[PDB]
Design a protein around this nucleic acid. Sequence first.
RNA 1: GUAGUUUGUACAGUUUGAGGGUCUAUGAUACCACCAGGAGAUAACUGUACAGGCCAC
Lengths: 130, 749
Amino acid sequence: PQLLHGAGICKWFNVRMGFGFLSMTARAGVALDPPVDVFVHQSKLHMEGFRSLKEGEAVEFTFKKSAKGLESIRVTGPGGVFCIGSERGDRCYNCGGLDHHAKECKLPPQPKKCHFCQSISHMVASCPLK
Amino acid sequence: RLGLKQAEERLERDHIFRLEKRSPEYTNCRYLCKLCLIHIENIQGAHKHIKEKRHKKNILEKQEESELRSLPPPSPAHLAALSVAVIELAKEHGITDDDLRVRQEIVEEMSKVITTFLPECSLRLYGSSLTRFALKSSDVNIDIKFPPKMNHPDLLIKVLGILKKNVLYVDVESDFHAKVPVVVCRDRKSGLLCRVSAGNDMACLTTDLLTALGKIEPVFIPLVLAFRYWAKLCYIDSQTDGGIPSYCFALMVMFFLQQRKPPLLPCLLGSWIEGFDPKRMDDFQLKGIVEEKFVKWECNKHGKSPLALETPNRVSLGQLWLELLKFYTLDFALEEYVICVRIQDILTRENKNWPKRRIAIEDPFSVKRNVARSLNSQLVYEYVVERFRAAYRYFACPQTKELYYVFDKFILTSGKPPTIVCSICKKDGHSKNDCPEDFRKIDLKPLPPMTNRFREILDLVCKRCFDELSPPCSEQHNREQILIGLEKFIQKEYDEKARLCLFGSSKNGFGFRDSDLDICMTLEGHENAEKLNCKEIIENLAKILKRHPGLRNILPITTAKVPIVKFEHRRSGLEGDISLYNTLAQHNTRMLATYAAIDPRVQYLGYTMKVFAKRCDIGDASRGSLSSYAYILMVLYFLQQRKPPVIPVLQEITESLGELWLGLLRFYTEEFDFKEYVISIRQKKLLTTFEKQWTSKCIAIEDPFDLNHNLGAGVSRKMTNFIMKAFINGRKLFGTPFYPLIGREAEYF
RNA sequence: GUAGUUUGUACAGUUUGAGGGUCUAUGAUACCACCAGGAGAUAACUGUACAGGCCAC
Ligand SMILES: [Zn+2]
Ligand SMILES: [Zn+2]
Ligand SMILES: [Zn+2]
Ligand SMILES: [Zn+2]
């Protein structure tokens, strides 16, 4: 890619509108002290679908300098992996978890327990405390 | 502990239940689906059993059943409207007694037409037409009673030709391949179908039984008019299409009227027969109908049984018509019990030793066979239950207009075409137009244009199979020297009257360079082996050839037409056979050699067929396929059918070689029907399988002389599918242009 | 009574298809808002449960 590389962490990123800023600890492959702020947009995230970033996660990018400030042209995860997104795609109905899915799931089946109050009496959509 | 007890409720939501004890075969499995009837192993496998698409269709099936199980009972206004609907169906176009008279007029006119040409034949109207268990647009059932001095396929073909010549009974078909070979036609004056059969006097007696019941009870006449109109509105009546016959539907509602409590038709065997037993009920053979009120019966002492209740109880036709579909959708087990009305008691499948995965009905006077054998596919059966469901869903739901009902197409068909199982191959998952084994439908890939270089390549490939296996003249000189030497040896040792005649692999035109010396024996003053002690000659010649230090491999064989001895010349190392006045096999070999001598292209195509069958794993009958003799026979049959006939018929007394072989592949893919016509030489006519009764066998490749066993009657239908695949490959791999390496053309093929 | 060459439907695993709130862009300091109780939608191969089809013993 372009020689203006860099790496760092994600200072902030909006999921809804799709841009943010990264705390860059590296500039063009050279480490920095103190870290600086570089703009990022969802289109800069080299991913498919609705691209987004989790605030606080590590990122590797190629950047540029503009009138508004430093902007990261192309952003990926560590090792080129996909990014996460702000987290505050369905759980396994066997176990209530994103770790596996039902065909993949091999643990013995679980009772119909509500997620909110941790009781097998009712389902979570009919939880009284919800 | 209770976590699993709550988890199993999701399985129990759709018919999954744990099993207490191990099955004899499904031992390690612990769970079972009621709808799938397939044993399940564990709970994760049960959720894996939940993902099954068969279990997905079953859930929808059960949901539809439970959905229309709980419709509200019909109101008296609803009952009156249903009565109006069934009487208007029965009267407007349903066969009334007036339309029964019209049907009788139709049968009398057809009887006049047939007896103008076949006066010895006599037409009997019977079946679903005459019974007053009819339909608006039925097929008339007509039985022909004839003197037995005639061929039943011949009279059926003659009646078919008469109806084809006839202009009134249009749409003549020759469906001679069903369980009953029937001619089809269409009466234009009524504009309703008619059919011709013969010899089914059991169904004639059943027809008389039903018609007597009809002259007893009045609800008889509209009920099967309504039921058969539902059945033709769901395409279940086509027994050729894997369905159930209309006569069997007549028997079905007869069983309903027998079993609909309180009963409206009495049974044919019961407590008035003192000394009766339910188990030996098949021994109580019945006979014809007396005074249209009783059924005769006799054991080989006799008597009669009533067909009436002494008061014709009157209930509304709408209630009867609704509870008929109640019985045959939600009350009667269609598959578990054979529909049997010889007794009031329930008769099972193994009681008549019949299979247990579809509907079985019994002919009253042919209790040995199941007349409902045409149900095969499970999917068609579940569609039939769905059509019963759609009928009960509509007709037991109140309408708006004002209550009013009419037998609309879309209310019961639901727009979905019927699940017609393939009438040719009888395998589900594909329709009649989707049958891969159908010979005639192999036309979807027309050939690319045939370059002359491709024609030369095919000519070289077909020629190489002959020239690589053609015997040379020096071998003929050696074989005639062995012939005269063996003649001198047998004359000087056993009998001077012995004279030798080369035949077979030396002289049939189909032998090769290192083939056997097949030699026929002749005796001076003896024109046949009947005057000769064949076993003594065979054993003495075997002993003497054993004493010969120049001939080995000596072994007598008695499986031929006349007993033979196979041996081998040690010096030439050449195998050979000695045959004593072969009864017929030698005459058939001589006829094949004469056919070879008429045109050498016979030998070229036959050698090509042998090598191509070898590379397509079907080389000979020693590998379970067609024999090379059968290959020569079907080659000669192709040359006959390639009009103008390249070989003639001896018993009745310019295509290029690669294109001849490719045209053989083309003819034996689509231009010929194996299940409908016979591969045989004897007649120039396209000899039907119905003519030779080999419809029960896969391929009818019949020897012109050996009429005892069809050669394909020893060959399986899956082998027929394999050789059909080989023919299709010859249309594709051999028939489409390609330019491989020199010498590698046939190897690529 | 049993083998032989074979169709569907399912079968367990593997490889591809929606990744299963998918979808949806609004380029410089903020979004993640607001649940169903549901055990995951095809194509190919392997092994196969079961009936149907066949030829021989
Ligand atoms: Zn899981
Ligand atoms: Zn709760
Ligand atoms: Zn099931
Ligand atoms: Zn078919």
